[PDB]
Amino acid sequence: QEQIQTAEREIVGQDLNCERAQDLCRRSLLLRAFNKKREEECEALCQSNKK
Amino acid sequence: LYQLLDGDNTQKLFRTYDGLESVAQKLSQDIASMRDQLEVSEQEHSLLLS
């Protein structure tokens, strides 16, 4: 029982919460979407400069 | 949770999380202390019977 309890504490401690990786993925996606919007805005200023 | 542990509506103006953990530890200690007293009392009783 003492061995099982030690092993249990280890599993609970390993509860792989890949929250950091997931956060980075979320941020990456949001920034990609942000980049796309900002590229559209750059294209609009380029048109004004041509004029 | 704090109200349940401290019983005393002493309107403490500032409740802290550290205070909450301390009052929780106290309850556990009180129960442990009461069980120890009961065990002693049981020994005393057993000696008297012997």
Partner: protein, 115 residues
Amino acid sequence: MDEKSTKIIMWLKKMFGDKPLPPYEVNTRTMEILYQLAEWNEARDKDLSLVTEDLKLKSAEVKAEAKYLQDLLTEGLGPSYTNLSRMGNNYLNQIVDSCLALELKNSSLSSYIPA
């Protein structure tokens, strides 16, 4: 003795409501027992009220999260995640029911195994 007596009479009035307080033998022992009982009841009633209010709050919070997860899954996986086969639904119900039976925080193995 006069203060304890007042507390008991008030407590009995509260417990029996609109029913006339039944006549009982008022001696030192009967008063002590009633007094211990009154103190115990009052302390437990307070504890149960706090637990009941908290459970109401938790019920609301769980409901809100359930809606959130449902919406997340509908938007991400489509309505088709709810169209599982009869056996699939049975498996899902068994996991859910097992977790509820052990009062687990979640369906992870890290929770199920120690329980």
